[PDB]
């Protein structure tokens, strides 16, 4: 029936306690990845922080800092600016 | 053709006015500006830890000019937020009385705002005129 | 002196109390409800009944 | 599901059978005369009675 014996109740004491790669992006800049980014940003018709992480292995913070500096240099032309996303092109004379 | 604080972006106005107070250096900056949080409801000191007091002062000056008169309690209620009581759901708690009162006291010291009838603080004549001056500066730097 | 809300709820409970006392004491005389007459410096309560002579 | 009920239908036929000459096709006119020609305790019921009366007026005018 539904009235369990004291042994069945005490089985609770025997039920026991059982139950049911890291990325290595840049983070810190150096000369090789410097020259790599300044050579490859003349490409990538669409550029953002995520694209920087994707195609350059950058630490996100460095992506935002590099986005600011490259906008200073004028090589990427922002289409919009937002605190959570940024949009950049190659500032081409063809587009 | 007439320039008022209401005529420009709130955020950029507070940024410009905070930078102006930083440059002036006459605002009475309290001792524990770099130590304590702005309310028990927050968990981290302000991130721009050197100019955040100037940001707070500029924002409260703009708000006081916009309003008839406000006091410490209105200050904490505005600058407070939702805090987690641990697992228990977010509860709205006010800001810090010390910071929201010391900013008003220092702004009185510089003379931006005056203790007014009906209680609370109300913007001063000189504080008003320099607020519109800063708004004119923003409407000049914009172009 | 008291607030309007508390004043009116106290009036209601007072009405209920006099009514229930009147029906616990005057059930034998055909009690059939009461009305409270309120005037300034004078208040009367009118009792509807059947054996009015006995309630007198 | 806008089926009118027994009370409104009976009131409508009762009104029509004895006020056809004074009744019209304009719902507003029948609504305004109903307030004087029949004692209805609700504006909603009055409007429903009036609407069904005009519906029946159209029925008679058709045949």
């Amino acid at each position: 029936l539904s009235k369990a014996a004291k042994a069945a109740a005490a089985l609770a004491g025997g039920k026991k306690s059982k139950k049911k790669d890291r990325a290595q992006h840049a983070v810190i800049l150096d000369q090789e990845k410097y020259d790599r980014i300044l050579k490859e940003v003349p490409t990538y018709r669409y550029v953002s922080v995520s694209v920087l992480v994707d195609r350059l292995k950058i630490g996100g913070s460095l992506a935002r800092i590099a986005l600011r500096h490259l906008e200073k240099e004028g090589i990427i032309k922002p289409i919009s600016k937002h605190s959570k996303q940024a949009i950049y092109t190659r500032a081409t004379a063809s587009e | 053709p007439g320039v008022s604080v209401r005529d420009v972006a709130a955020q950029d106005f507070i940024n410009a006015y905070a930078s102006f107070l930083q440059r002036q250096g006459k605002l009475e900056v309290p001792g524990y500006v770099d130590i304590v949080k702005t309310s028990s409801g927050n968990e981290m000191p302000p991130q721009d830890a050197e100019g955040w007091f100037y940001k707070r002062a500029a924002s409260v000056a703009r708000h006081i000019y916009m309003r008839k008169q406000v006091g410490v309690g209105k200050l904490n209620k505005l600058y407070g937020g939702a805090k987690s009581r641990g697992v228990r759901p977010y509860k709205h708690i006010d800001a810090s009385g010390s910071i929201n009162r010391k900013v008003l006291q220092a702004l009185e010291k510089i003379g931006i705002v005056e203790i007014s009838p009906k209680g609370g603080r109300r913007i001063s004549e000189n504080g008003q005129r320099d607020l519109d001056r800063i708004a004119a500066q923003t409407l000049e730097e914009d172009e | 002196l008291i607030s309007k809300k508390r004043k009116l709820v106290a009036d209601g409970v007072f009405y209920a109390e006099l009514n229930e006392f009147f029906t616990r004491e005057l059930a034998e005389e055909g009690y059939s409800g009461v009305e409270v007459r309120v005037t300034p410096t004078k208040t009367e309560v009118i009792i509807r009944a059947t054996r009015t002579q006995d309630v007198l | 599901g806008r089926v009118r009920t027994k009370t409104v239908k009976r009131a409508s036929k009762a009104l029509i059978e004895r006020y056809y000459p004074k009744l019209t096709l304009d719902f507003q006119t029948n609504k305004r005369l109903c307030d004087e020609i029949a004692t209805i305790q609700s504006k909603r019921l009055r409007n429903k009675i009036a609407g069904y009366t005009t519906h029946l007026m159209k029925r008679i005018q058709k045949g």
Binding site: - | - | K4, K5, G12, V38 | -
Partner: protein, 100 residues
Amino acid sequence: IKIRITLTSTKVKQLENVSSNIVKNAEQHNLVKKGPVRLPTKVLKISTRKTPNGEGSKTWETYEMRIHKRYIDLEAPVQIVKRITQITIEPGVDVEVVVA
């Protein structure tokens, strides 16, 4: 001699026709009035479970008592103020007169 006579009740009909008779009595004698201005009705609401024992489905019900409040602004000498105050009294309508 300004008086702001304030009435409060629960029965809309009695309270309102008391106010109407007060304002009509005032208007014929030509006392300055500012209308029988009506405050928003105050709904005294109590929520309680229907069952007295705790069983059954979890059911909840609300009891409402609606309180209506009016006040009439007047300026009148005491001789007519006495008649204004004493002329009309109705059950369930609490009446009080104030100075200015």
